Copies of this chain bind each other. A is one copy, B any other.
């Protein structure tokens, strides 16, 4: 329950930036969204946290800093360097941390003027952008004249929760950030680094508030974080597809969490009607996902396992039929495209050819002695007898 919540909370103070890696279909973004919401009490992104997600077009110029045309005057288009998503957070997490200090950072009129120009949603007019660029030069003249004891403990914890960190070209997006994402290379650490940015030339350093909880999938091995110098920075939490949630009681505890006892009585009798058709056993979908994830571990890899986001939203046996033939059996066929004696073994129907089998055998044969099976759409109670044979 709170174990994955506490495990994120421990590693985000030790290493600084956690990564929830796992097979797709488990609670990676969910346990990352529930962590930042329950720690910052802010249900929508804004000042205290910002959700982004990476892709191949999420380059360096729009993440940290780059040139961006902006004039706000319908004339005299001013080619100025604008800060990306990260530098608008790390400068915000710094100047929010420079409020609670007593007398070390003597900027109490000039720091709050910089914070109100960093959280301003309306884009910056040039008569106030020259104030923002001048106060930011004051900030890195201020930071550097502060002791490390009055800079390590900055109070408000900021989070840049990112998603699909492996999907973007992570060594290119992280530019100057490739040497700043340790816990002791930030501000306030034992070895602080006021590193210099290329484009604007103004120096930069991450504050100790900003934590980067970044979820990724590791079934695509084409794009996995194999740089061995961006696995030292991050702390990698294993989020395995846990079939413990697909019980009768654990599915009743999860799916009846936010219903206010109105449709909960409808949900209770619907799950009572689902498991009465599976054989009066409370432990069906637990060992169904277990006997598939074990049988897909020994064949493909540990990482291509079926998650528990597929079967978690079933209500009746019809909804299990529409999540079997339309979400996971097309997924199981594209692991093993025209590899038929293997996909027959994942459903352990290897001796079973005809009858209540998902892949019935074609009565034809080949000229060179080959054969291929055909998918059989089953319905009714014969579908469950074709499914209970997996267990």
Contacts and interface: CB of A to CB of B under 8 A. Distances in A.
A294 interface: yes
Contacts of A220: 226-229
A217 B238 contact: no
Given A163-B195, A225-B334, 19 more contacts: A10-B322, A25-B232, A29-B179, A33-B191, A45-B193, A53-B175, A56-B171, A57-B175, A58-B175, A63-B198, A84-B198, A163-B179, A184-B313, A228-B304, A238-B330, A299-B366, A301-B337, A302-B333, A302-B374
Nearest to A231: B331
A51 B193 contact: yes
Given A50-B196, A121-B137, A179-B163, A71 B364 contact: no
Contacts of A373: 302
Interface string A71-86: 1111111111010110
Given A192-B43, A364-B298, A367-B345, A53 B319 contact: no
A132 interface: no
Interface string A299-330: 11111100101100100000100100111001
Nearest to A172: B56
Contacts of A57: 59-61, 66, 172, 175, 198
Pick the 7 closest A-B CB pairs, nearest first. A55-B175, A219-B228, A236-B330, A57-B60, A62-B198, A301-B338, A217-B229
B330 A85 contact: no
Contacts of A334: 224-226, 228, 231
A224 to B, nearest CB: 7
Contacts of A341: 367
Number of copies of this kind of chain in the complex: 4
Interface string A220-261: 110011111101100111101000000000000000001000
Interface in A145-200: 163-164, 167, 169, 171-172, 174-180, 183-185, 190-196, 198-199
Say what secondary structure dominates the interface of chain A. loop
Given A130-B74, A195-B51, A341-B367, A235 B137 contact: no
A326 B237 contact: yes
B14 A322 contact: yes
A21 interface: yes
Contacts of A121: 137, 141, 202
Nearest to A144: B44
A385 interface: no
A279 interface: no
A355 interface: no
Contact of A191 (B15, B30, B169, B180): B30
Interface in A260-311: 294-295, 297-304, 307, 309-310
A321 to B, nearest CB: 10
Nearest to A89: B196
A75 B76 CA distance: 8
A174 B55 contact: yes
Given A79-B69, A121-B137, A313 B14 contact: yes
A52 B204 CA distance: 10
A370 interface: yes
A51 B226 contact: no
Which of A7, A80, A364 has the most chain B CB atoms inside 10 A of its CB? A364
19 contacts: A29-B185, A30-B191, A44-B192, A46-B203, A52-B176, A52-B196, A53-B176, A53-B179, A53-B195, A55-B172, A55-B174, A57-B66, A57-B175, A74-B127, A76-B77, A167-B171, A238-B330, A299-B370, A302-B338
